[PDB]
Design an enzyme around this catalytic site. Structure first.
Site, short mmCIF file in Angstrom:
data_model
loop_
_atom_site.label_atom_id
_atom_site.label_comp_id
_atom_site.label_asym_id
_atom_site.label_seq_id
_atom_site.Cartn_x
_atom_site.Cartn_y
_atom_site.Cartn_z
N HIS A 97 0.77 -1.25 0.00
CA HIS A 97 0.00 0.00 0.00
C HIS A 97 0.80 1.30 0.00
CE1 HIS A 97 -2.84 -3.03 1.65
NE2 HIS A 97 -3.76 -2.33 1.01
N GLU A 108 3.44 -2.06 7.26
CA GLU A 108 4.31 -1.87 6.11
C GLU A 108 5.56 -1.07 6.45
OE1 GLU A 108 1.96 -1.06 2.58
OE2 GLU A 108 0.73 -2.84 2.98
N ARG A 153 -21.86 12.36 19.38
CA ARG A 153 -22.32 13.53 18.65
C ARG A 153 -23.73 13.29 18.13
NH1 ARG A 153 -16.52 14.07 17.41
NH2 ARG A 153 -15.95 16.20 18.02
N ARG A 210 -14.92 19.83 25.07
CA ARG A 210 -16.36 19.53 24.94
C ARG A 210 -17.19 19.95 26.16
NH1 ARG A 210 -17.45 14.50 21.79
NH2 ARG A 210 -19.62 15.09 22.19
#
Ligand code: NA
Ligand code: NA
Ligand code: NA
Lengths: 251, 251, 251, 251, 251, 251
Positions: F6, F78, F166, F221
């Site tokens: 990838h 990887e 949320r 928050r």
């Protein structure tokens, strides 16, 4: 004397049938078989009543499953040992969505697995999904006979009472995990409750067998009326018509 | 005209009965009822066949459950709504321990919960345990008829095939978590497999109902013989005599 | 020098004992041993204090487990390596049902597994069930000495505080899974909380060992009074009498 | 200036589009868009590259999801906030069944949920099932271009390596519950592995959105060949033609 | 006369101590306390022996936890109610990695939660992680005395026997999910087994308390030798010196 | 042509680098690399953009992970095949504790595993814990540059929306298991939400790789303000400074 442990059937009894229509109630089997040609009683052992008939010249079997995944799993296994490769479930059901009306038809694409027997075939992660050919035949059959049809997900429960959040019961109790569960399924677009499809669909999808399910709506839990018995029978007959017409396209 | 959704029974049908003997097979109900006084057929709907009889002048109901937790849970709930408070399960079973012989009697103290319906009544951590008074009456009754009795744990499975690690099946496959499971239960002292006790015992223990279970051994999977029909009949009668004798002490 | 890793005992120390009475508190062991003949101190290592005595001419061991499943599991394993095959737990406990009064006796048929160590012996599905002979001996012993006895299910928790829904704590917090859990157990007929029986019963039932449990009620959480210390000691002594009398019938 | 948190898109950018074609690779987006009319690049932020085009006079959006459920869930949510109601996944894939050949097309009816994000939308028992209308359009489109098509279940993994039981890795280790898992899925008829469908299908099915998935086969792990670059390109184009043709019937 | 339910301690007994050193063995408490100034025995109830001492003019408490999470959770809770905010676990341990030698020191960053009590504080997904300031002080202290130190993950088991995959036991059985588990932990870099850290660390991390753990290695299960009593004593003293030195920097 | 499936990289591309800085956003990679010597673009495939640079004469790689555990797991695997042994994650994040201010720095000791990919490396019981050396280097680096630093636990979610509770979303629905979850994490002292650390830390800790994580706080928050874009960029730059300074001490 039988070839299987529970159904009381031999291989020869099926006369080459490879498709089964599988209602829940043994007392309903004869009625379904009589829609077709040369209906004959094969056996009645425990909750498993089986009739043979012919559909467009091909032998079919109608065999009851009893209520629940466990007896369903026995029927499917033993019918498979007798050569059945395609299973179509027919039922009548409540709905839990406001837009679904009494007399409508539900075709189940997959089930919420609120059962135990499905786990004996595949881990929970595996989808209780219907065969595409069976689902297509059921949708087409419903379209053909002028049904009002909803296609989607069904919640499949091991109980009639607490698993479907019924409180008018002996104890009036629903265990924590199931309390408020109906609202959850409604919020996720689940159409209805029944008691056998998680087992049937999981078992078949993981065993190289084809399965589908259709049901007639007899009550809607969001606008709940006492069913008229004549209406129930008519809706039942309508769903039976659809399942037989679908079977014709799966032979 | 029924007072309940499935059983087709009214309160009047029971004539004050508060104890039920509950076999699995509807065809077994008549034979059990006829061991007692004034036996009468009540109803037969789906897998639920019910008979009333009299024991020491008191009404008792015999009602079949069908195979599996889901139909069992319906029968127990609806019988409870009709006044039943004590449930005695009678069956015949295989065994999975070498010391248990054909013709022996098993009394179940608790079940391994390899089912789904039990979870609709209590989370998995809750024990599927029998009522002490019922278990005591069954053990005493077994002694009274001179049975060879084993008292202990039963594995209660939602399937007959993969959950009991049977490989002579359509697919020959057993899902990973059940592969090697039989050897595990054997090592832990589990006596036998059946398909209803986890639901029956969990339900009853969590709902203020009393339940017990007795079964006659017809096969042993560690030394597996084809059962003789005559021997099975004798074992059935032996176990039925025990359950009726126990019922006498639970009225 | 010891034959086991934790208890500080040799095989010879037991003088052929095959039954153990297993209280939680090491400081309580001597008191129990002195009910019997020729009580002698064997060892005190960590939370494990052990005394030998003789009951109707047979050596018995009294050994503390400490608090919780983990230390209990060590005591049971090491006593089993030293020849113990029967384990009787004695404790004092709260009750969570309104009908259970202070001074009553509880005999546990099985436990709700709110512990971790039980899982090291059997998966959650397996019942934490007492041996029938031990339970019978405890029930009979309680009946013999005029106890008010309740027989049933106990919730067995790995914690004293949040697992039993206590909020008068340092944080005042109870994690979501346990918040409201007490009400759930009450609704299912659970009698009481303690901290060792899930491990003891699961371990023994899966290992071919016999176990039972009896406890005296010192507080009722539904009508909660501060215990009188004299009443606590009397109830403790009463439960000890019962466990020793039961042991006499299990030799 | 964006209407959404991640995609960098406004409602205006979509020009009324209600269908999205959603490949994984941002570099694949342009090629798909250019098969349709008036293709225009909209935005490129993180793994989300979006293009608009026109199909039978109607606006459609092509938007990449990145690899995995988490980025997929962001793309679907934000596209839904921008008016997208239908999502068609296009990919290329390996296969794990011997009968599936390179160049064949897979239409996914449902996914095995070997992911985490699906659980943020529905509990595990809920099926990761495709929309029937989307699946039908994809099957019909595959037929229209003369594809060799397999319709069934896909295993949807949160990893490329251990979750697909690859051992030619840095550690060469596969955690216990994934060791032997590939053989399990193969035995249950699972067609292939990929990494997004469990999230996509579960999300959409539980949120009133329609989703389907089609993929071209580039390798078969049971008869593993190095893919030819030319063949992969042809297979990519073949699958893209199918997804665009399906989109035509879903507008 | 106690301020807490189990420990038999008053607020006054601690003389303002806010740090506790917590060994498992009650008999180890005196030896640790006597390394510091003005050591005094406070109380001994059940598995909880407590001593006070002074370190750089500040009061510190040494209190035993007993074996296992359940008794540990009681000690931590009740010490917190008495003003303790920092908990340093000291032990001796085996190791399961070939590179770890007898006499080496292990500092635990986090635990594998193979316990039950941790779940009474936080769901399984929550990490059983040590406080950074405590871990830092322990690592620094180990360096100060010239220890050979390994810093990493410990597997924390509710049992000594099957959970640590010991087979030289009464039954010789290890339940399926623990069979082969040791090799799994070894492959994942886990240093050692013990029986309290999962509870200690989870509890503290979720309750605003600081915890760390250090242990001296007395055996290595990959190269298993009988420990020498002299060497174990030296290793114990070495680890105790480290925990006291760390405590100095955490006051 | 690439050595990995990838990333589009060869072993030679890294020029001996054994440490990677791993941000989420491919578009952020260049900015980080340019803090160091001789920054050069290596590859951009999918969400994986990689740059090489030199830090105190040693090659380092900066490589984006994309959003979520699945793409992170590909990048880590990887890069490990390409010789990377140390992974430092840098991000910006919300906080969920009142005492944490915008512009503060969070160093993560361990993660709450609300992801799926971590389970592909270790069972849930295993801690998603950072390497002590990496955490120490990050803490020291933060101290060195005058940061306001919080050290502790991060909740790592497979979703941005429902998993972080949320509700201003397309459906406004949060599934039962996640509804009220934020309050739970807050009560347990969890600092913040992000989306990759459970996978990164679990993967590395179980595979013999070192990992750490630092993040700049851009929103809280509990006292939620719209972030100023200049402040966000400054906080991002500050966190980047810290991660590079930590890397210098890990070479
Ligand atoms: Na049935
Ligand atoms: Na203990
Ligand atoms: Na991604």
């Amino acid at each position: 004397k039988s070839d299987v442990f529970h159904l009381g059937l031999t291989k020869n009894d099926l006369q080459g049938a490879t498709l089964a229509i599988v209602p829940g109630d043994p007392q309903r089997v004869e009625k379904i078989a009589k829609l077709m040609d040369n209906p004959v009683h094969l056996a009645s052992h425990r909750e498993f009543t089986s009739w043979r008939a012919e559909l467009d010249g091909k032998a079919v079997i109608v065999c009851s499953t009893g209520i629940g995944g466990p007896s369903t799993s026995i029927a499917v296994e033993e019918l498979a040992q007798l050569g059945v490769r395609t299973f179509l479930r027919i039922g009548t059901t409540g709905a839990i969505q406001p837009h679904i009306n009494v007399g409508d038809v539900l075709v189940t694409t997959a089930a919420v697995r609120l059962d135990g027997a499905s786990l004996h075939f595949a881990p929970m992660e595996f989808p209780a999904v219907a065969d595409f050919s069976c689902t297509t035949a059921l949708v087409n059959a419903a379209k053909s006979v002028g049904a009002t049809t909803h296609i989607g997900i069904t919640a499949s429960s091991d109980t009639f009472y607490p698993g479907q959040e019924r409180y008018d019961t002996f104890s009036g109790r629903v265990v924590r995990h199931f309390k408020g569960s109906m609202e959850e399924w409604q919020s996720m677009g689940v159409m209805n409750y029944e008691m056998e499809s998680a087992t049937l669909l999981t078992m078949c999808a993981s065993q190289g067998l084809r399965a589908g399910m259709v049901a007639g709506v007899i009550v809607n839990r969001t606008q709940q009326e006492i069913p008229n018995e004549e209406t129930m029978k008519a809706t039942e007959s309508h769903a039976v018509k659809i399942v037989v017409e679908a079977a014709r396209h799966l032979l």
